[PDB]
Amino acid sequence: FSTAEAAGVKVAAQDGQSPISDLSVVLRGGSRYATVPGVSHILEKFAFQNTVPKSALRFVRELELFGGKLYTHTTREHIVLRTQFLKQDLPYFVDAFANVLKETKFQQFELTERVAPVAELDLLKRESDPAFTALEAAHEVAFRTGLGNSVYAQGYSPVTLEDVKEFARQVYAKQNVAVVGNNVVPADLQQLVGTAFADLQEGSKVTQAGTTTLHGGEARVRTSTGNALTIALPIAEPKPVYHALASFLGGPASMPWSVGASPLAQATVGTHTSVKATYHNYGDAGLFAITIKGDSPAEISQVAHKAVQALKDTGAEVTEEQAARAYAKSKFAAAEAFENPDSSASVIGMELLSGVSRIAPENVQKFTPAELSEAAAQLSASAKPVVAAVGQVHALPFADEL
Amino acid sequence: GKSTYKIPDFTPYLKKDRNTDANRLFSYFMIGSFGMLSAAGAKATVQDFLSNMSASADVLAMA
Amino acid sequence: MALRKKNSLLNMANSYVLDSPQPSNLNYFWNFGSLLALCLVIQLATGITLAMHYT
Amino acid sequence: VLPWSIGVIIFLLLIITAFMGYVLVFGQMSLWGATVICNLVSAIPWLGEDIVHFLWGGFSVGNPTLQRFFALHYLMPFVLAVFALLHLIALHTAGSSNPLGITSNVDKLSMHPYYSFKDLITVFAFLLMFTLFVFFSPDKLGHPDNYIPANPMVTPASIVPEWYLLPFYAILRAIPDKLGGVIAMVAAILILLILPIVDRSIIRGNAFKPISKLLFGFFICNFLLLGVLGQVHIEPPFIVLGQICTIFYFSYFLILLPMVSTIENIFFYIGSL
Amino acid sequence: VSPKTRTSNLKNGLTIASESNPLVQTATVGVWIDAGSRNENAYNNGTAHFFEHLAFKGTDKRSQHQLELDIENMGGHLNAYTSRESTVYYAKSFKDDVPKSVEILADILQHSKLAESAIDREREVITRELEEVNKQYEEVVFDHLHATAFMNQPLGRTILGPRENIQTITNTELRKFITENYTADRMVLVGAGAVDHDALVELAEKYFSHLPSSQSPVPLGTPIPNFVGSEVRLRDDTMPVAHIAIAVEGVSWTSEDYYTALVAQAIIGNYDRAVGTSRHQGSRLSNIVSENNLANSFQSFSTSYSDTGLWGIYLTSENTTQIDDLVHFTLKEWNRLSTSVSNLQVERAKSQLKAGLLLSLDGTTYVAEDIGRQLTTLGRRVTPAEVEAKLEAVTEHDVRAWAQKTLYDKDIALVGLGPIEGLYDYNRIRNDMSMMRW
Amino acid sequence: ASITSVVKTSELILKSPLLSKIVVPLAKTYVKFSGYRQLGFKMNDLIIEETPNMQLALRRLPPTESYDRVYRLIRATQFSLSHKLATGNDITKPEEDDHYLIPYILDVEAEAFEKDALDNLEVV
Amino acid sequence: ASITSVVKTSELILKSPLLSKIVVPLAKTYVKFSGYRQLGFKMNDLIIEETPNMQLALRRLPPTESYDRVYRLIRATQFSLSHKLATGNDITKPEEDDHYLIPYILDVEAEAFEKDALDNLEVV
Ligand code: HEM
Ligand code: HEM
Ligand SMILES: CCCCCCCCCCCCO[C@@H]1O[C@H](CO)[C@@H](O[C@H]2O[C@H](CO)[C@@H](O)[C@H](O)[C@H]2O)[C@H](O)[C@H]1O
Ligand SMILES: CCCCCCCCCCCCO[C@@H]1O[C@H](CO)[C@@H](O[C@H]2O[C@H](CO)[C@@H](O)[C@H](O)[C@H]2O)[C@H](O)[C@H]1O
């Protein structure tokens, strides 16, 4: 991805040998910047609504003639708007993004009839998975605001047209926009973005209201639709070793009809439960989480105890074999993330918008057993553990039990 | 008895040539013949019946 | 929505002669109702016609 | 549109009902009215004459015709009642309109007791009018020639339809061609079916439309003049006048209402800016 | 223009097919087999799926635990799936872990233990799978759809097989199945992403050289199915969503009408109320359904096999009193493929498909799946230029001719699951397969 | 006629200096003799509402505008049945006769007419 | 007749030794010639259901009993339209002909009849 600049907008493109281009606009407008709860999700759903030059209807009908596709999502850090099309149709897609950023109408009826109902179905679909809910609840406890804001719009806190219009005034600005072109000729993209995004406001960098503060605690989301438990540990100093540790502890099987050889995978033997360790770097803070879902609260409780034991055991001693296994699983995870278009866009988006150089998968550091055990030790001895229980909460573990 | 993927036995009723044009055409021949006789019967009925309104024999005798 | 359901006049006919939900096991003794309707139609047609010629 | 369109058929059924009932007396106007009106069917190309003989049951209006008109005169009011019920069922989906032309969904009244008791006033006003005709002047609306028994030999001085058919008779006379005249006469009723199309107004009804109200006034008075011209002798200058009034009748639907309603739309918009 | 797919053979008849991408760092290598559940009889139905479980239960060399560890140490993952006509075993890894992954795949396919103890253990796992597919409504619907459309025929059988067979499958019949079916002339070793073709061919010569050849080597994707117009109703008033599939007999992979059927399918298209753009789609059915809230979703499909196919639509709806309207309007849009479609709809659908067939292939796994599928169904990878030409050859009047012989007034297979009281009897559904006005 | 048609034709007239010089005074007189203001209506209250497009436009009105419209309709209905005219503050003054509904119906119709056009597109 | 009355009269007969000696054999023959068991019905499946009381009793059936009743009705309807009789396991055996509904309707009716009595109480 050759990073450049076109009329004040940061543009990264990588040419390839495929008939298919992905063009993504990455916006510094994720939920950590949300002025009002859920406004980043609503803004994401407001992309490709009516603009002054082109109605939502006309856009969709023309997109079908190019056979293009539209993908949008919101993170804690970004809004990502991605189009996938045939290489030659690049100018159309650049111009469409320009229309969205410069000239979105933002009509009350669109919010009531189109945007808010779609946002609501989006969230309900995600919440069908209790593990999603548990990990969201854990961020809320751990950070409270900023990173603790909900990613998604919820019914209890309604987003108004004025909220979304104000947020868009900040976000849709040269300072908060990065353009990422996969299988796009870099010189051609710079020329097009330079003509299309020239009259976009300069604006200012969007910032998190308040510094990131870490907190421990518990969340007990009572649902009737499945059971999950997250054990999270807020990290004050994000370090790359936690990726290796997440992949080491593991949890999912690398093989069909198996458990897996990872410590967390081996904690689920005899149970119909699954487990996943994840590490979330957010630049100024991090979150190390272990999420366990299952149909039995008793089995989840059983795994949860073994999971914290596994982390303590890791803090004691890792073997050289296990350290190498962690390097391999982590290098692989890095590679597939840089390949997947959604995650790719945000990785380079981070590099362009912030200044965090991407770590190439081939440059992923190998951590010694000493460095890994030290990382697990810090986590086992954390002063601020977070536990989010979802489902039959009366039957799930508490922080003080773990 | 328990599995719903095991279709009950329909072999006493199934025709082997169920997908052929000859198969469909036969049933449309029956439907068509029925429509044909109904059209011929309706025409005959309507014609005979409505002829009551044309000049009766006593009226034609005085013409 | 299908016109036969949407339009109030068509929907009345629909409710009696087309979509009308019937038991699946009516035997031939349930056919006398329609025969009575047939007799009534024949009597109306033939009767009105006789009235054109009767004094 | 649907209750209105069924209504147009009700109106046609009423005409046919009343025409046949009038023949039943078998006075001079009965016979001669039947003769001329049924001979209009002779204008249907190719089969017209055969159809007339079929309708008559013979070679002129006679006994077979009278007996079939009795049977059908008895029947047609039942058919009319059915269509009257159908147009009300069709109306029930939208409800009654109202003199302002706006929705009434905001402010409804039960039919009973309000309109029940309001209907009684006009029932008694109607019965007063009925009483004055039936008891004090029972023959005012009729033709004296219908007290002469039908005579196929003697032709009455003037053969006119009953007063309520006179406008359509004037329209028929206006066209010199036989078939032309019949088509125009039928078209004068069937053209009611196009009002939903030719009225281009964005507003329902005339309460707030001064120009439409004036046009409506001229249309109604023209219809009454056509009625009067249906019973004059075919003489100057009534021949040309009947043609002008016929042109005006059709031009209401085809020209004036589409133009006036278009212009009023623009006046409402510009006038209220 | 994507890099060219290279193809080589071994002496036994194993095909090696590869598409390199020097922009990625991962590689998907795997074995596509022209064999699946359809190759079983009624007695050993479920064997192919049974084997898929035991393939990961340990080999002559590595035990189950050693197998787990070897893959963990590689860093990537292994995956497998068995369908009616196709079995796949693949490994996603890092660029330089490709020789390890080929070696593991060769081991689990040729040298699997199939130990009585492991057969007995999986026999319970698979028994539990019978009572948990019940939740995957789409799968329930499509399995009943095959069962009824291909009534009492091999394509009509499920992949899991009946409960009775699961209890009686022996290592003998497992061994027999994989010896008869997993032959070199039926197998394709596929590499996509960061793979060198010449390196992959050498790895094939090292690991897959002692594969049996079949007695009568037919070409890849060589097969008589007799479609049954029929219905299965699985009414369940406690479910909130009705799931309905309607299909006719469709087209095989090598049909002359293959592309015509794809264009027809794209004219109806898909719809999902949860996607923002779906209310603005050009498809007439999409407009009817969204404006009237008739469905949560619909998905047109054209599924192909070696000698037959199913073409139809899958609907989901909460609108339980207007199922009749939903089905009515769906079948009336199919009628218009015969009566009404012109260059307007056809050229639009062709535009959409020319891109869609290329878009689908967006990662190494999708590319490998495309190479493997095409090699095992057609015997060759069809270049995008050839595909563009075949699509361009489809005219409105080809679509009309195809719909008139395939859809118009034809028997359907119909499956309804859930609150389907409002789904009319077979005749009233099948009567909508024609228009009395035409 | 669609509101779109009426608005477009009116704009053609308002552009032409000559045309406006004649039409605008006539239109103002027309509106005065129309007398809908004497029942406390605004012009837009009179527009036929029993169409899918108009029902959609009415649903998009801000709640406040919607509540006020309901009151004007009820008040006018009461004047109508009583055979009375508005007096005092009930009479709509020319400055109060705002086109509150026109923007909503123009948007509804714009989409509906674009949909009709795009349903008839031909790939070139 | 109410189910209550039928059950009470039947119990009077079953109590009386002489009465039961005559009635029970006749009742068993009656049921055999009735032939509802040959369509796979239980006796209680035949009871008229279109009354408030019986609708309430049916709603109180345990879900399993309720699901099984639905199947027996559908199966019998299919035998009826085909002019076939049940064979094998579809025939209701005497031991399967259980009074699954009688307790529910007796409770519904007990309350309904108590309500009628208490609506007519007179303070003494
Ligand atoms: C339920 C409907 C009807 C029934 C049961 C019925 C019954 C009868 C009977 C039993 C007769 C004596 C027939 C004979 O022996 O000659 C008769 C005669 C007659 N009916 Fe009807 N009728 C009905 C409807 C009508 C209708 C609607 C008319 C319309 C006028 C009508 C007109 C006549 C006439 C004119 C005669 C006398 C001529 C004759 O005997 O045939 N009938 N009717
Ligand atoms: C036997 C003759 C008729 C009867 C008994 C009849 C009866 C009625 C009744 C009771 C109503 C509702 C109350 C009212 O508005 O007056 C009505 C409404 C209506 N009728 Fe008629 N009608 C007849 C003929 C016609 C004709 C000939 C037409 C049209 C050419 C017609 C068209 C309508 C329409 C359009 C309405 C709805 C009017 C509205 O509320 O805005 N009707 N009719
Ligand atoms: C919308 C429907 C269209 C209009 C319907 C037309 C109504 C009148 C049509 C013709 C009726 C008279 O037409 C005439 O019918 C009678 C039978 O009815 C036929 O008469 C024939 O059969 C009758 C008995 O069935 C014999 O006595 C006669 O000797 C023989 O010629 C004539 O050959 C035919 O010329
Ligand atoms: C028999 C000749 C055919 C002509 C029809 C007979 C005329 C009699 C019809 C007028 C009586 C009113 O008839 C009444 O109509 C409505 C809708 O039409 C029916 O309503 C029924 O169907 C509609 C949809 O089909 C559903 O919204 C409703 O839940 C259901 O009850 C009534 O069950 C019926 O009683």
Numbering used by the authors:
A (entry chain B): 15 to 416
B (entry chain E): 39 to 101
C (entry chain C): 1 to 55
D (entry chain N): 111 to 383
E (entry chain A): 26 to 248, 260 to 474
F (entry chain R), G (entry chain G): 2 to 125
Q: What does the article say, verbatim?
A:
CIII2 catalyses the transfer of electrons from the lipophilic two-electron donor ubiquinol (QH2) to the water-soluble, one-electron acceptor protein cytochrome c, contributing to an electrochemical proton gradient across the membrane. The Rieske domain is tethered to the complex by one transmembrane helix and a connecting flexible linker that acts as a hinge.
The consensus 3D refinement of combined particle images from all samples except the sample with atovaquone yielded a map with a resolution of 2.0 Å [Fig. 1(a)]. Ten cardiolipin molecules on the matrix side, four molecules of DDM, four phosphocholines, four phosphatidylethanolamines and two phosphatidic acid molecules were modelled with truncated fatty-acid chains. We identified 1326 water molecules in the 2 Å resolution map of the dimeric complex.
